[PDB]
Amino acid sequence: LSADQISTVQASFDKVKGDPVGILYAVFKADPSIMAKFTQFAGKDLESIKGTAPFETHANRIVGFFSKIIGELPNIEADVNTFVASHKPRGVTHDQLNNFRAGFVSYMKAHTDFAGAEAAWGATLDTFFGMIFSKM
Numbered sequence: 001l002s003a004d005q006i007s008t009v010q011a012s013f014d015k016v017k018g019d020p021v022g023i024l025y026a027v028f029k030a031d032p033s034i035m036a037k038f039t040q041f042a043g044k045d046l047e048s049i050k051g052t053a054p055f056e057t058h059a060n061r062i063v064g065f066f067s068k069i070i071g072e073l074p075n076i077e078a079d080v081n082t083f084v085a086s087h088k089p090r091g092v093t094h095d096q097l098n099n100f101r102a103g104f105v106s107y108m109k110a111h112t113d114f115a116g117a118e119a120a121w122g123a124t125l126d127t128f129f130g131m132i133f134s135k136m
């Protein structure tokens with residue numbers, strides 16, 4: 001993960017970072033068991049809560065932190081540590097994490113011309129999820 005790839009990803013992310021709700025929707029849609037961990041969304045129709053204020057609040061926090069991480073590549077260790085601290089005790093599994101990844105990439109493919117940033121994103125996400133999976 002070098003500056004060339006980092007600059008590519010960050011340019012790519014800048015195009016979509018204003019749509020937190022869209023990104024979280026794509027993740028929840030890829031894996032409903034992620035949605036079922038939120039007391040505020042469990043048992044509801046995803047298509048119906050997508051436009052409500054609670055969804056947006058959550059989406060802004062979650063994609064907000066991801067944004068922090070993308071902004072500081074590649075010095076992400078301390079933030080991954082924080083993520084693991086808050087999420088390890090909620091029982092998040094490797095499956096769910098990989099579905100988060102899949103949902104995000106699906107979002108990125110359906111909203112941008114992704115083919116030009118795909119290898120850089122691959123490097124980034126392999127690095128990030130590589131660190132998470134070593135810790136939880």
Ligand code: HEM
Pocket residue numbers: 033034037038058061062063065066067083086087090092096097100
């Ligand atoms: C994919 C599996 C994941 C599951 C099952 C999960 C689950 C949750 C749950 C249950 C909450 C608490 C919401 C609330 O009580 O209001 C939450 C909050 C949060 N999540 Fe995750 N999350 C996942 C992935 C991620 C990822 C990849 C990030 C990185 C951006 C992230 C960042 C956050 C942040 C910043 C919060 C707010 C602070 C907190 O309460 O932890 N989550 N998530």
